[PDB]
């Protein structure tokens, strides 16, 4: 993109300043997605529990 090339030159300025599919793949990505979804569910559950504990307060 024109804006994409703008971003590339921006990252170059930043550097300046700083100075078919098989079962093997199907199953592995399937498991990885299951793991990531479980992680997201657990993190959200922790956040929701913390929020409800905060809001169940008594001021």
């Amino acid at each position: 993109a024109i804006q994409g090339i703008e971003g590339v030159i921006s990252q170059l300025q930043a550097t300046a300043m700083a100075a078919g599919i098989a079962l093997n793949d199907v199953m592995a990505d399937m498991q990885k997605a299951s793991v990531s979804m479980q992680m997201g569910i657990q993190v959200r559950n922790k956040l929701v529990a913390a929020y409800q504990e905060v809001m169940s307060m008594q001021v």
């Binding site: 199907v26 990505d29 399937m30 990885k32 997605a33 990531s36 979804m37 997201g40 956040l47 929701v48």
Partner: protein
């Protein structure tokens, strides 16, 4: 073949689900505990199923601090929307509780503040009347529509944020008081006059008045006064909802 790329679908369906569910758990009527949890989760899931395919999918991994920042952003947006909506019901509850306290309904708070003995029954009456009015004016549909619309204004992707904007929501805390005063005003003032009248009776022969004649008279007068004042809340109800909605529209952006 038989690809079914799972990460793409997960990243497309997750963050809109997080924002929709964050609104659901805090938005009035949609956040009431009487709804079973599975009903709320299913409503969020179905709304996300309808909305997400049109949105540009994000590619940030769930196993990164960027995912945590995204989740925090969605939670903040949802709770801000729900709470700004809840402010109007807070104002109505305040006005009702004050009318009830000038009724002398709960006199034990003036002598024992927060002593496990308080019944703001008028506050509950007008709170549920306000909920009925909000249901009638289809405010919840609007809430869902605005939750969808805040994407165009603020996309899922991490975007920079502002400051006094938060103050605005916090400064909305003034409205709860300011609008509450007006609703009361249309009744408390006359009640005040009534109490003033009772004072004139006590300027006569000492004692033998107040706590024996004032309470029943003022209770009946408050009852019939605000029974007549009931038709007045609905225009004020729409005014409150419009105030909350356009404040949300102006400040969320």
């Amino acid at each position: 073949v038989t690809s079914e790329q799972w990460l793409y679908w997960l990243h497309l369906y997750f963050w809109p689900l997080l924002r929709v569910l964050a609104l659901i758990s805090t938005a009035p009527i949609l956040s009431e505990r009487a709804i079973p949890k599975r009903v709320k989760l299913g409503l969020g899931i179905m709304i996300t199923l309808v909305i997400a395919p049109s949105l540009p999918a994000n590619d940030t991994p769930l196993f990164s601090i960027a995912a945590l920042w995204l989740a925090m952003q969605q939670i903040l947006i949802g709770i801000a929307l729900g709470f700004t909506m809840q402010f109007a019901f807070a104002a109505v509850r305040t006005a009702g509780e004050f009318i009830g306290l000038q009724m002398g309904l709960s006199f034990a708070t003036f002598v024992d503040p927060g002593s496990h003995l308080n019944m703001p029954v008028l506050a509950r009456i007008m709170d549920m009347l306000a909920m009925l009015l909000f249901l009638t004016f289809n405010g919840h549909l609007w809430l869902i529509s605005l939750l969808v619309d805040t994407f165009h204004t603020l996309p899922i992707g991490s975007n920079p944020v502002n400051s006094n904007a938060f103050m605005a929501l916090a400064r909305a805390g003034g409205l709860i008081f300011l609008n509450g005063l007006m609703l009361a005003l249309p009744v408390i003032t006359l009640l005040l006059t009534l109490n003033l009248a009772l004072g004139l009776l006590n300027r006569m022969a000492p004692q033998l008045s107040i706590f024996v004649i004032g309470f029943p008279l003022t209770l009946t007068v408050g009852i019939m006064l605000m029974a007549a004042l009931m038709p007045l809340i609905a225009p004020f109800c729409e005014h409150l909802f419009s105030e909350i909605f356009n404040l949300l529209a102006d400040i969320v952006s």
